[PDB]
Each structure stands twice: as structure tokens, then as C-alpha cells.
């Protein structure tokens, strides 16, 4: 799995609440978080399948 899979999830500065997935390396699985709508970092996926494909877990 790529290095960015290990980075904490990043809501960012914008003030929407968009459901996204991140890989939680501590839990070994993709989980949901609230994304603000702009300036996403790389550990931010539109589906669990996208997250699992890139970062693993589950």
C-alpha cells in the first residue's frame, strides 16, 4: 500500500459535509469520515472499494 495510506484523514477547510473513505492503518480497514469539500489529501476515496483497492484492509 502507498505511503499516503498511512496519513490521518483530512477534512480540510471547506464547510460542506461529504461522506468519504480513508484507510485507517491502525484498524487495518477503510472507514468513513466527513470531508469538507475542497483541498483533499490523497487518503480520501469516493467508495470503500476504491479505498480497499489502493490501500488494502478488509
Amino acid at each position: 500500500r502507498p505511503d499516503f495510506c498511512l496519513e490521518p484523514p483530512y477534512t480540510g477547510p471547506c464547510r460542506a459535509g461529504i461522506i468519504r473513505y480513508f484507510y485507517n492503518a491502525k484498524a487495518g480497514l477503510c472507514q468513513t469520515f466527513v470531508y469538507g469539500g475542497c483541498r483533499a489529501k490523497r487518503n480520501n476515496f469516493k467508495s470503500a472499494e476504491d479505498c480497499m483497492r489502493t490501500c488494502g484492509g478488509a
Binding site: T11, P13, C14, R15, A16, G17, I18, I19, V34, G36, G37, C38, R39
Partner: protein, 224 residues
């Protein structure tokens, strides 16, 4: 909204909820068939919910209308956040009544120190996730552009202004974006961004609606 209070029921008849699965952004009703929101709230399908107070319970004043057209400002920049504004055309006109009605576009931008009303169903905590059932309100003043730029050096474009407090604890937050800042009976701001929510020395940043009066009126005319 962090550090605010529950609005009086249906006392902000121009406030709408944007819903896709669940509530994700706010908006402001500015004509029978048009809503103003933020460009970063864009989705290809949106249901607009008017007349809401408690978004989890049927109260009997609601109107749910799907968006027919969704139009981002053509100069929106998703990296600088410049021109963060969007229009939504409703598939049918909203029924205008005591609990659902329009907010006036502004004839002048608001002076520093002007007290404004900011509202939404966004997070009520600066840390954690407490998304409220009932609509929240915050009374907050317009900051000088100099203080706004000093708070966020290099980041404040001509489309942006700050409203809030430097001491912390009172601000808009996630799921408030796209919603209204109303001052002296006019829609002056769209909830946009900030660093955290209600952090010290990091006030809320809002789109200056006054700069888009012509764009709004012409876009309505071109799509109506």
C-alpha cells in the same frame, strides 16, 4: 454552527437544506425558483428542502423540491477557493408563505462591525461531531478586510470576507457551507471555509454576495 443557539422555528424562512442521502450543505432562497449556495457544495443531483426546522422530523411546513439545474460560478477555483458561489434552479417553484420566503440581494456590501445572522445545521463542536436536528443561529460581526487578511495571510481573495470572532468558540462549521449570512435584511454572505471551526484567531471566511448581484440576475434571466 459552534457557540450559537437554536433559531426560533421557521423564523429564517429563506434558509434551505441541501440533501443527498442526508443534509450536506445549506442555501438561501432568493426567488420562487432559485437558491444561492457555495460552488464546493456542487453535486450532480440535489434535493432542496425548504420550510425546515428539525431536519429529522416531519413538522408539516416542509417542501422538498429536486434541483433542475445547478450552475457553479465560471471563475470558481477549487484550490484558491476564489468565487465560491453557485445557483440552483428548482424543478418547480417553491410555495411562498409565512414559513418559506425569499431573502433580498444586497444593494451595498456590509460595513465592518455590522452585526449579521449566520445559520445552518452544521457541526456544533470544534472537536467531535455533534450534528444538530434543529436549525442553529449565530449573531456575529463583519471583520475589517485588514483583520481578515492578517488572520489568513495570502489566502483572502476579492471574493471573500470574514465574519466572526478572534477569541474562538463562535463560528460556522462543516455542513453549514452554502448557507446564509444576513445583515440588515440582505443576503451578504455564503458560508465557505475556515481553518478548523471556532479556533482562536481563525474566523469564518464567506463569499461576498454583493460582488455577484449582476451574475445572479443575468443567470436567472438566461435560464428562465
Amino acid at each position: 454552527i459552534v457557540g450559537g443557539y437554536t433559531c426560533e422555528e421557521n423564523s429564517l424562512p429563506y434558509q434551505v437544506s441541501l440533501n443527498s442521502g442526508s443534509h450536506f450543505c445549506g442555501g438561501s432562497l432568493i426567488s420562487e425558483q432559485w437558491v444561492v449556495s457555495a460552488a464546493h457544495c456542487y453535486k450532480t443531483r440535489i434535493q432542496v428542502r425548504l420550510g425546515e426546522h428539525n431536519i429529522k422530523v416531519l413538522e408539516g411546513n416542509e417542501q422538498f423540491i429536486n434541483a433542475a439545474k445547478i450552475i457553479r460560478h465560471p471563475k470558481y477555483n477549487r484550490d484558491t477557493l476564489d468565487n465560491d458561489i453557485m445557483l440552483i434552479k428548482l424543478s418547480s417553484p417553491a410555495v411562498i408563505n409565512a414559513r418559506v420566503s425569499t431573502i433580498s440581494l444586497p444593494t451595498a456590501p456590509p460595513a465592518a462591525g455590522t452585526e449579521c445572522l449566520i445559520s445552518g445545521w452544521g457541526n456544533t463542536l470544534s472537536f467531535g461531531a455533534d450534528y444538530p436536528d434543529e436549525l442553529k443561529c449565530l449573531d456575529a460581526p463583519v471583520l475589517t478586510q485588514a483583520e481578515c487578511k492578517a488572520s489568513y495571510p495570502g489566502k483572502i481573495t476579492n471574493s471573500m470576507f470574514c465574519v466572526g470572532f478572534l477569541e474562538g468558540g463562535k463560528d460556522s462549521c462543516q455542513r453549514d457551507a452554502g448557507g446564509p449570512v444576513v445583515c440588515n435584511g440582505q443576503l451578504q454572505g455564503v458560508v465557505s471555509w475556515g481553518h478548523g471551526c471556532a479556533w482562536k484567531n481563525r474566523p469564518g471566511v464567506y463569499t461576498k454576495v454583493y460582488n455577484y448581484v449582476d451574475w445572479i440576475k443575468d443567470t436567472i434571466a438566461a435560464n428562465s
